[PDB]
C-alpha cells in the first residue's frame, strides 16, 4: 500500500498505518515535503517513516 | 463528523479534513492527548484544532 502515489486522505491513512502508536505529523505545504515525496512522485516506507514520531 | 468518539482511523481522518492545507500532528501516546480528549470521550472542532499546525 505504500509504494504508489498517495495523495490527502490516502496519504495519512498510509501514515496511520505505517507509525502506529508512534504517531506522526503531516505537513502538506512543505516544499519538497511529503506531498512532493509521496503524492506526486512514487511514496516508500522509507519516506513515511521519516514523518513518523 | 467531529462531535463524537473518534479513535484511530476516524480521528486521523477528522484531523484531515479539519486542518486543511495547515496539516497536523498525531501524537496518540500523549497523556491526556488527543485520544483522551476525543477517543475515550467526546471530541470537539475546538479540540482537533489544538493539534492543526
Not at 507509525?19 to 503531516?26: H, K, L, T, V
Not at 519538497?32 to 503524492?39: A, D, L, N, T
Given at each position: 500500500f505504500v509504494n504508489?502515489?498517495?495523495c490527502?486522505?490516502?496519504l495519512?491513512?498510509?501514515l496511520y498505518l505505517v507509525?502506529?502508536?508512534?504517531?506522526?505529523?503531516?505537513t502538506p505545504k512543505a516544499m519538497?515535503?511529503?506531498?512532493?515525496?509521496?503524492?506526486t512522485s512514487i511514496?516508500?516506507?522509507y519516506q513515511l517513516?521519516?514523518?513518523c514520531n
Open positions: 504508489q502515489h498517495l490527502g486522505s490516502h495519512v491513512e498510509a507509525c502506529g502508536e508512534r504517531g506522526f505529523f503531516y519538497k515535503g511529503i506531498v512532493e515525496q509521496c503524492c511514496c516508500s516506507l517513516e521519516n514523518y
